[PDB]
A paper describes a structure:
To address this question, we sought to determine the structure of ALC1 bound to a nucleosome with a homogeneously ADP-ribosylated H2A/H2B dimer on one side. We combined oriented hexasomes featuring an unmodified H2A/H2B dimer on the strong side with an H2A/H2B dimer modified with a tri-ADP-ribose chain attached to H2B Ser6. We incubated the resulting nucleosomes with ALC1 and ADP-BeFx and subjected the sample to cryo-EM structure determination. Our map, with an overall resolution of 3.0 Å, is substantially improved compared to our previously published cryo-EM analyses of ALC1 bound to an enzymatically ADP-ribosylated nucleosome. The map indicates that only a single ATPase is bound to the nucleosome. Importantly, the local resolution in the DNA region is sufficient to distinguish purines from pyrimidines, which enabled us to unambiguously determine that ALC1 is bound to the DNA at the strong side, close to the tail of the ADP-ribosylated H2B at the weak side. In addition, quantifying the occupancy of this map’s features with the recently published algorithm OccuPy51 revealed that the acidic patch on the entry side contains additional density, while the acidic patch on the other side does not. This is consistent with our previous biochemical data, which showed that an interaction between the linker of ALC1 and the entry-side acidic patch is required for ALC1-catalyzed nucleosome sliding. Our cryo-EM map does not allow us to locate the macro domain, presumably due to the fact that both the H2B N-terminal tail and the linker of ALC1 are too long and flexible to constrain the macro domain to a well-defined location. In fact, the observed location of the ATPase places its C-terminus closer to the N-terminal H2B tail on the weak side.
Numbering used by the authors:
A (entry chain K): 42 to 500
B (entry chain D): 28 to 122
C (entry chain B): 16 to 102
D (entry chain A): 38 to 134
E (entry chain C): 15 to 118
F (entry chain G): 14 to 118
G (entry chain H): 28 to 121
H (entry chain F): 20 to 102
The structure:
DNA sequence: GCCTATCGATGTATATATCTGACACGTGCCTGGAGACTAGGGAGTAATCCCCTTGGCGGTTAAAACGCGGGGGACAGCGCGTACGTGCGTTTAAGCGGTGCTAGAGCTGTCTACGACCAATTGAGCGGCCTCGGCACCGGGATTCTGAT
DNA sequence: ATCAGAATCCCGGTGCCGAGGCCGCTCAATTGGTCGTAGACAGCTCTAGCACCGCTTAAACGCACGTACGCGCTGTCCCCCGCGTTTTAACCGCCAAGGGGATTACTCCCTAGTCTCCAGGCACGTGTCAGATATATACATCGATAGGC
């Protein structure tokens, strides 16, 4: 016993227990959020406190979520001895004596880079089960993480995801074979492509795919869970370009002038085009030297980018409407420019970014709760995962993405373990630019993938 | 009575273009002949290697041109290249 | 405060300890402080002479990648034959 | 407190690096220098990784040999400290310009 | 009718073409190669002879002699680069004394 | 025997050498004795180096020859060091050497 | 799939004569292969000039011998010339 | 018909003339025997090759061309003879 | 009793021999030396007259160049008198003294 | 004032153990080396010519060899103070594991413009011969540097 | 010191022989033609080169301190330079042998060329042990203390 939330969590624990009673690893792919941590804690107390197996447990998760995993365990299962292997080399060395030589823990909390660097210590333990959070990292069969983790002595493995498969069948068999390689090595040897006839079985033997996966993978859908039903309406805004960036966009398609050398938009390199075009439509001061004086402060910053012209207007509107917002960026320097605008406006903000430390991330999260911070500045990658951000009313994708599931993952920072209010999602598009092409290409990937991933248990 | 060809007459014709009043001594002609032969070997040697590295059977004006740019310094190369392309243009324009 | 960040000039990326570390392999015990700027000049002259020839081969072949053979041929032409990257 | 006297540690370093086979310049800084110099000769060039690596092997070998001759010039002048005039003398006698 | 005339050169294009064949430089020789090569040799010859003629005139001699060729070469950086390892018989040296050696 | 190398008693490939001489534009005609003589010389020099490198690896207590051992082998022999006087070997390093003036007293 | 060729197997068989029970790293093998190509071109190049200076059409073993005499250091040449002579006089007897 | 000793024919004042053309102001008395050593080593290496070309041609007479080819092979070069 | 002071006429010699073009070694002594060295490599050689001249021109040019680099090495040590240690340094840095 | 220890602090070499990727090795294939057989011209050979190298001689001079005085430079010793080696605490960015894109190196197939080869014809340039003036060399002037006062 | 006295330029004159032109001719460059292959172009595949984020951790950086090295100054003395005299042999002009290099006509053996054939060397896939990495030793050098002797 320890906590209660939602009725479907019981049948999840029963299915998990049944898979381990069948003595195999398994994948849990219930929708983004839905309390997979809660069901994992329930599994641990079932093992330790009904089956009475207390062999050591290993948990791997991203850096941005470690403190949340501590808290939820320390809330809901105080009876389990849980410790965290983190810190400097000298600190982690001391913890070898303090913990690994002393054997007083049920559970380790860890993160991937640490377990890759200190792997030889983790090999020494016969683990009861391995839990991998945000398992998409294991989609690639070249990865050293999948090699090392598949080599550990564990009784069973559990992989957690908010959405299995990001692109294609090779990701599926990679994830699937790394759970039970004796059953599925032929798949990663490549036979499964042939067996499912390169997805040219998508409707001709869909039932074959469903019957392959459903005994082995559980996945339940948020529209099926429904319950509170806050809406998630998305709108797309198309916008042009100001004259400065119009000149440079054409120049990038052609050649730069020596005026652009004094503005230093040449002496920068041209060996890739797509990156430079995206910068140009997003903001020309992403190029070095293009802002005419380094001491400049003023609303010209909002004029040099069409996106910023709309965003300034939209943020002023939303702020006047009292709505709080999350901004996701693909680029670090774009967050820097945006924060300069927040400083110029004097808006209340917080920031999470790959350079931000673990404590600072925890502090920032607690700071964005508890009080009306207007806006959160987030990297799409480091900020996209795990966290509760129900405090926001709205989400803006300032820049597009090559994979739609990255946006879905970011949007799911709301609604995990419920949300109180409807939320709007706003996408900004550079009209008649390469940004439209990337958007259309990305959408095409999703339109393929759903025919597989709406199968399985959901059928 | 035995025959031995040399560059001597062509060197003298060029001399009379740049300095009509000047003459040249026999020892100096021997040096000039040596110089022409030495430069010929250097350029032809590089042109040969360039064709070999590219698996090409034929030596062509391209090989001469890039051999020149590898061997000569600085502006001396720039003038030499300009003279070559000019001469070939005239020759192929004529027939 | 954050709009832009300075960058150091690329030749200064040949750091002071890196030069000392080379000189120690040459057996040099003690080093006067003027030598670091002197050495950077000498190195830059060397690279220019090799790269100019290497690019000349690449362009005659009408490629756009510079290739390890181009470097080997440039080094051989300048009398500094290198073993280990081709033949 | 404890200290080694001046030059005691320098002799250790000589013995270490003469025994080692490592490359001594950081790779990524050296790569930027090469890719910059090329822009004077052609506006846009890609590089094979092995091409950059060959340039570093040649460059470090050249500098090491130069420091040996530089050291002899300093000893000949009855100094122990090498100075820029020693590099200039070496390059002149080798006929490098 | 001669190819030299047709190209406007003084140097002998026909002779150059024969030498390119006989020297084993390659299997096959294109028609443009001898014309281009002859032009370069003519240029370099004119370049040296101009400077040598000036040196002889400075020396008030009407005929060029090997001394004048040496003075012509060693005072030009690009010719001295090209001929850096060549010795010229009866050339002598450039006059030069180190400043340290001069009297006070 | 079929192979010309085995008539000569050589290990190196006489036929491959003969082909390369023909293709290389070295001359108009190649006499039948020249490949045999050239192959023998290349084999001799190969054996000469490898023996010295083998000793260095054995002295260094390792069973595989590596580039360091080739550098040590070449630079310690007066004739090989003259033949390879202007060659640089990748991953070679240098010989240990310190001038006596620099040593402490 | 595009076929190359190299000296590697011949170098390997010579190694097993001078030292059995030893191996060679692939990096070292590349250096050995490069060395063989260098020496080949030095000898063949000088043999070409020797034929040209004497107005001969044909390369012969006598050109190869003189090229070796010029290129190799003073004693290393003497053994090489012996090995070359021994091989030819054996071959011609077959 | 046998030659000996005549390296000492490279006299002291003859060596001074060479040093003067080189711009040398003062000469220590040890330089002379050091110089004669260096000269003898140079000649031996050139003459070795010139004889080698002469034997290949089956000639008994050493020619100016043999010297010029020997010098060129050593990476020196001499304009104004042969060629 | 008139004497020039030391080093003055030494400079006049430099100015003279840098302006002249002549060969500076005595010819018959040099020829005997050439024939003596060849005597080791083959018996009863004969020489073309111009072959001996070519050897002398090359040899003299070599030594004159060597004395220049020797002079630099002496000045570097703040001396003005050349000494054998200077020659040994010059030939080492050139890479001749293998 | 050495010089002999003394401890002891530090850095390097040694030994035993575990784990991993690069190296030897076996396999199927194919393309390039071996085995005939032929044509013709590069080379070896004997004979001849006559150019050039070797060798010797006598006369005259320029140059080398030898002795001397003395002054300038090489050398060792000394005192000064600066700059560069060693060690510490703080800050930076090099390195690596990912993610994704598409430019461009590498290959195949076609076909036609080019260069090799040939015979007939012609004049460019070669060897031999002749002549005149650019230069060498000489006697003797004027000019300008040294160095002792 | 301004002056004497060596030693460098500058000049007009004499004459020698090499540079420059010319002639006759022969052999190699030109013209006009045929043949068949090298390489110029179009199309295609998919390797690998460029770009960015995220994160750890060793390297680089900035500073304080003290030493020993670089340097300027001085005094000693010996070894080189400048010069006059004596001795040597290099040079030059002439003669004269005959060894050897250079050319010729001739015959032959060796090499390139062609077609057929098959096994040596390559690209590939695999298993395991030589070396890399840990770490717990052992043990030599470097100093300060500071002995003594």
């Amino acid at each position: 016993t320890g906590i209660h939330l939602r009725s479907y969590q019981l049948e999840g624990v029963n299915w998990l227990a049944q898979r381990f009673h069948c003595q195999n690893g398994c994948i849990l792919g219930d929708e983004m959020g839905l309390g997979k941590t809660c069901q994992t804690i329930a599994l641990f107390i079932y093992l330790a406190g009904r089956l009475n197996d207390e062999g050591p447990f290993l948990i791997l998760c991203p850096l941005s979520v470690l403190s949340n995993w501590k808290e939820e365990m320390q809330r809901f299962a105080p009876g389990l001895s849980c410790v965290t292997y983190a810190g400097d080399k000298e600190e982690r060395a001391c913890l070898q004596q303090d913990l690994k030589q002393e054997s007083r823990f049920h559970v380790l909390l860890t993160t991937y880079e640490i377990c890759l660097k200190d792997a030889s210590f983790l090999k020494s333990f016969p683990w009861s089960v391995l839990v991998v959070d945000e398992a998409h990292r294991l989609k690639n069969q070249s990865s050293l993480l999948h090699k090392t983790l598949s080599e550990f002595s564990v009784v069973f493995s559990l992989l957690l995801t908010g959405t299995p498969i990001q692109n294609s069948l090779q990701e599926l068999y990679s994830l699937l074979s790394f759970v039970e390689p004796d059953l599925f090595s032929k798949e990663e040897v490549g036979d499964f492509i042939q067996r499912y006839q390169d997805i040219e079985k998508e409707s001709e033997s869909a039932s074959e795919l469903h019957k392959l996966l459903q005994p082995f993978l559980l996945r339940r859908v948020k529209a099926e869970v429904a319950t509170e039903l806050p809406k998630k309406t998305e709108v797309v805004i198309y916008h042009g370009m100001s004259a400065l960036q119009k000149k440079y966009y054409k120049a990038i398609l052609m050649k730069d002038l020596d005026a652009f050398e004094n503005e230093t938009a040449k002496k920068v390199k041209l060996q890739n085009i797509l990156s430079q075009l995206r910068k140009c439509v997003d903001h020309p001061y992403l190029f070095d030297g293009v802002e005419p004086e380094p001491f400049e402060v003023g609303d010209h910053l909002t004029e040099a980018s069409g996106k910023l012209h709309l965003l300034d207007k939209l943020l002023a509107f939303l702020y006047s409407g009292g709505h709080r917002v999350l901004l996701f960026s693909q680029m670090t320097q774009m967050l820097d420019i945006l924060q300069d605008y927040m400083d110029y406006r004097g808006y209340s903000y917080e920031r999470v970014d790959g350079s931000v430390r673990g404590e600072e991330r925890h502090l920032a999260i607690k700071n964005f709760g508890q009080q009306p911070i207007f806006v959160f500045l987030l990297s799409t990658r480091a900020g996209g995962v795990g966290m509760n951000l129900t405090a926001a009313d709205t989400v803006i994708f300032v820049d597009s993405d090559f994979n739609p599931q990255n946006d879905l993952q970011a949007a799911a920072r709301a609604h995990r373990i419920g949300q109180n209010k409807s939320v709007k999602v706003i996408r900004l598009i550079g009209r008649d630019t390469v940004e439209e092409i990337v958007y259309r290409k990305a959408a095409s990937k999703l339109q393929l993938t759903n025919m597989i991933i709406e199968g399985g248990h959901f059928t | 009575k035995t025959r031995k060809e040399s560059y001597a007459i062509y060197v003298y014709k060029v001399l009379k273009q740049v300095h009509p009043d000047t003459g040249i001594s026999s020892k100096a002609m021997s040096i000039m002949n040596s110089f022409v032969n030495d430069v010929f070997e250097r350029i032809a040697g590089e042109a040969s290697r360039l064709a070999h590295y590219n698996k090409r059977s034929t030596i062509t004006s391209r090989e001469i041109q890039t051999a020149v740019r590898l061997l000569l310094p600085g502006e001396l190369a720039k003038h030499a290249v300009s003279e070559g392309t000019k001469a070939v243009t005239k020759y192929t324009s004529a027939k | 405060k954050r709009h832009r960040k300075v960058l150091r000039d690329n030749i200064q990326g040949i750091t002071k300890p890196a030069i000392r570390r080379l000189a120690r392999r040459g057996g040099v015990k003690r080093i006067s402080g003027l030598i670091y700027e002197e050495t950077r000049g000498v190195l830059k002259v060397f690279l220019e002479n090799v790269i100019r020839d290497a690019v000349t081969y690449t362009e005659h072949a009408k490629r756009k990648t510079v290739t390890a053979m181009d470097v080997v041929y440039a080094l051989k032409r300048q009398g500094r034959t290198l073993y280990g990257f081709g033949g | 407190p404890h200290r080694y006297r001046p030059g005691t540690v320098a002799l250790r370093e000589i013995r270490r690096y003469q025994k080692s086979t490592e490359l001594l310049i950081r790779k990524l800084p050296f790569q930027r220098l090469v890719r910059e110099i090329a822009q004077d000769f052609k506006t846009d060039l890609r590089f094979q990784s092995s091409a950059v690596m060959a340039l570093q092997e040649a460059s470090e070998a050249y500098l090491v040999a130069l420091f040996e001759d530089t050291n002899l010039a300093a000893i000949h002048a009855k100094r122990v400290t090498i100075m820029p005039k020693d590099i200039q003398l070496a390059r002149r006698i080798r006929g490098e310009r | 009718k001669t190819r030299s005339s047709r190209a406007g050169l003084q140097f002998p294009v026909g002779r150059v073409h024969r030498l390119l064949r006989k020297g084993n430089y390659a299997e096959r020789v294109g028609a443009g190669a001898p014309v281009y090569l002859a032009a370069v040799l003519e240029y370099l010859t004119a370049e040296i002879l101009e400077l040598a003629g000036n040196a002889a005139r400075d020396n008030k001699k009407t005929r060029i002699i090997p001394r004048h060729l040496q003075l012509a070469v060693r005072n030009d950086e690009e010719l001295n680069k090209l001929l850096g390892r060549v010795t010229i018989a009866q050339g002598g040296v450039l006059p030069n004394i180190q400043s340290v050696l001069l009297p006070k």
